[PDB]
């Protein structure tokens, strides 16, 4: 409703770096808000794409950002009559970023990994890796839970069970308020998908550089399955956390699996031991239900509510015709221990191929009326097809069915404006929470400041 669309703030990275693919707010030890922006195709040392992370200080005029430097050198360790190898070329560092306390987690989902033992090998595969930085101190650490040292023949002899070679850990990420990092790995267990969790503090204290294969004892991974419904489901394409079982001492995990059960798509709510509590099945095949998930309480009863994006949903129109527009589903958590029910609201896109629902960002309370609100992206929507961000206001019964405000893309065609969203933080310290929108196709981030309601 009250985001200012006139005086925007633009930050920009290098050309072709895909600056703005991911972003998040970051507060330092003194509570000063910055923006952390991932750029997954920034050039490395050998003039090859490796990705990179930028830490932008808040300035109303915007501009360029300093780099949050990570090591981009390939690594080799000859130990235990084996050879460990990490390949950071086209690893995509900055394809997801997330902030917790004064720590930044940047992940490279396509970092490759191989183990050589004479004439055998593990196979060079994208296990993924994440990089952790404490900018104020300079501390650095890595976390790569899917790295193994098992040779390729063993997997064949055991029918490819527990095969974490193509995890792509860091594809999606989130951090519980207690400080547990949860990584989505859609390719784990031969493209079923897995989750990996470990406390940030234990990632830092158990990491030493050059070890390449180290244990993190407090870490916890999900489990393989023989159920065909999970095959090629990409369990972990999107991840989120929330409170869904009534017990406040437990944190629950929300996991998107947009090709679950032969591209039906699904979202599951689990406990921290990855035991399943509820499962939201998709509505239409290939709609990519579960592409994006969001957790926030919209109706103000203190019970977290769930949102799920299906950006390829095809709306039925006259003359038996279908129109890919994208759809968002709202599920309101009921009172006490009961399953989540049918959707309380359906939001369907307007523009053909607009991909409404590609990103869903909680805004906090934007108009300060007592109900939390959200922003939904349609990165190829709008009457010009340049991109649109739609704001929906919370209310006692759920969400309003019509948007209160629409942000049209200030960038040219192909910018993918809205592909990444993040709200619910007040960056200019005016009492109202603000919204940052990424446009990786234009290598830019736009900051929308909320202002008092007119």
């Amino acid at each position: 409703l009250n985001l200012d669309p006139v005086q925007l703030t633009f930050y920009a990275g290098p050309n072709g770096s895909q600056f703005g693919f991911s972003l998040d707010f970051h507060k330092d030890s003194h509570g000063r808000v910055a923006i952390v922006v991932g750029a997954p195709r920034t050039l490395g040392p050998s003039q090859e794409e490796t990705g990179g992370v930028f830490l932008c200080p808040w300035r109303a005029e915007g501009g360029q950002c300093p780099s949050l430097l990570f090591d981009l050198r390939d690594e080799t360790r000859n130990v235990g009559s084996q050879t460990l190898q990490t390949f950071k070329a086209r690893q995509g560092l900055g394809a997801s970023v997330v902030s917790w306390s004064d720590v930044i987690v940047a992940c490279a989902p396509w970092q490759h990994w191989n183990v050589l033992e004479k004439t055998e090998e593990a196979e060079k595969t994208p296990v993924g890796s994440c990089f952790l930085a404490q900018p104020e101190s300079g501390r650095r650490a890595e976390y790569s839970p899917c790295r193994g040292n098992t040779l390729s023949r063993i997997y064949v002899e055991n029918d490819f069970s527990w095969d974490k070679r193509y995890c792509e850990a860091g594809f999606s990420s989130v951090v519980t308020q207690a400080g547990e990092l949860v990584l989505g790995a859609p390719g784990g267990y031969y493209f079923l998908g897995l989750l990996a969790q470990a406390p940030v503090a234990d990632i830092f204290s158990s990491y030493r550089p050059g070890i390449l294969l180290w244990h993190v004892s407090s870490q916890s991974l999900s489990f393989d399955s023989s159920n065909p419904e999970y095959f090629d489901g990409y369990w972990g394409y999107s991840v989120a956390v929330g409170e869904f079982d009534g017990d406040l001492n437990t944190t629950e995990y929300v996991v998107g699996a947009p090709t679950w059960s032969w591209t039906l798509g699904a979202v599951e709510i689990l406990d921290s031991y990855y035991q399943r509590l509820h499962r939201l099945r998709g509505e239409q095949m290939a709609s990519y239900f579960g592409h994006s998930v969001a957790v926030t309480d919209v109706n103000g009863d203190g019970r977290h509510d769930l949102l799920v994006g299906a950006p390829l949903y095809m709306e039925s129109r006259a003359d038996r015709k279908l129109a890919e527009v994208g759809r968002v589903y709202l599920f309101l958590q009921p009172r006490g221990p009961h399953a989540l029910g049918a959707p309380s609201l359906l939001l369907t896109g307007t523009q053909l191929y607009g991909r409404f629902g590609s990103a869903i960002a909680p805004l906090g309370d934007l108009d300060r009326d007592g109900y939390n609100d959200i922003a939904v992206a349609a990165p190829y929507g709008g009457p010009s097809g340049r991109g649109q961000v739609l704001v929906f206001l919370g209310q006692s019964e759920g969400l309003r069915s019509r948007p209160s405000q629409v942000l049209d893309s200030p960038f040219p065609t192909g910018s993918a404006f809205g592909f990444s969203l993040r709200g619910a933080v007040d960056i200019d310290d005016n009492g109202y929470p603000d919204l940052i929108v990424g446009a990786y196709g234009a290598n830019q981030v736009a900051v929308y400041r909320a202002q008092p309601v007119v």
Partner: antibody, heavy 119, light 108 residues
């Protein structure tokens, strides 16, 4: 806390067999490799072999192929070292080891099991 | 197999001294070396892993250094508890091999 609680000292005859145990305390035996090391006063420390209790695959120093047989039962969270056709020279103290962080290191040691071979 | 030549066999030193044990391998092992401690009539304790890294709980007076095929454990200011046996172990290759051993004995 991590602790490795081994079996009590064994007293056995030459030609017989003995199966030492190494029980994990405060953690899952499935987490890391588990190694076995043999200590003698003159000869010193010798590496017997290792097992990954997550799958059961083992490695051995060729010197010990035949005598030593390393096994692991995830259930009771215990690893085993089985010695066969015992001899005077098998009289030694046997430790089980696991690494702290590094996959390939030797950082946490059990108290040691004393084996004596004699008629 | 890789040969771990550990010197000296023993040394008689006093409290507060700064001493240094060395270890030399038959080939390069690129810091893949560990340092152990065996207090008299007791089991083993890990001191170092991967050349220089301290095992959790070990006092900072211990320190590992070295490279290629020559490494050095060092104790700054000996404590009464530090008088024990010390071994190096390589894990650059299977089979793992140990050093001969080094006893720290009280000087008088």
């Amino acid at each position: 806390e991590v602790q490795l609680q081994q079996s009590g000292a064994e007293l056995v005859k030459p030609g017989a067999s003995v199966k030492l145990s190494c029980t994990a305390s405060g953690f899952n035996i499935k987490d890391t490799y588990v190694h076995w090391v043999k200590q003698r006063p003159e000869q010193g420390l010798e590496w017997i072999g290792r097992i990954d209790p997550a799958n059961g695959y083992t490695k051995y120093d060729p010197k010990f192929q035949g005598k030593a047989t390393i096994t692991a039962d995830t259930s009771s969270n215990t690893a085993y070292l089985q010695l066969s056709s015992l001899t005077s020279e098998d009289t030694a103290v046997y430790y089980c080891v696991r690494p702290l962080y590094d996959y390939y290191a030797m950082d946490y040691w059990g108290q040691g099991t004393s084996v004596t071979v004699s008629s | 197999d890789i040969l771990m030549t550990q010197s000296p066999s023993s040394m008689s030193v006093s409290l507060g001294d700064t001493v240094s044990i060395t270890c030399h391998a038959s080939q390069g092992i690129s810091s893949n070396i560990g340092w152990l401690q065996q207090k008299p009539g007791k089991s083993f304790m890990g001191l170092i892993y991967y050349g220089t890294n301290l095992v959790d709980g070990v006092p900072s007076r211990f320190s590992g250094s070295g490279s290629g095929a020559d490494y050095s454990l060092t104790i700054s200011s000996l404590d009464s508890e530090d008088f024990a046996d010390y071994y190096c172990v390589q894990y650059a290759q299977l089979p793992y091999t140990f050093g001969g051993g080094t006893k720290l004995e009280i000087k008088r």
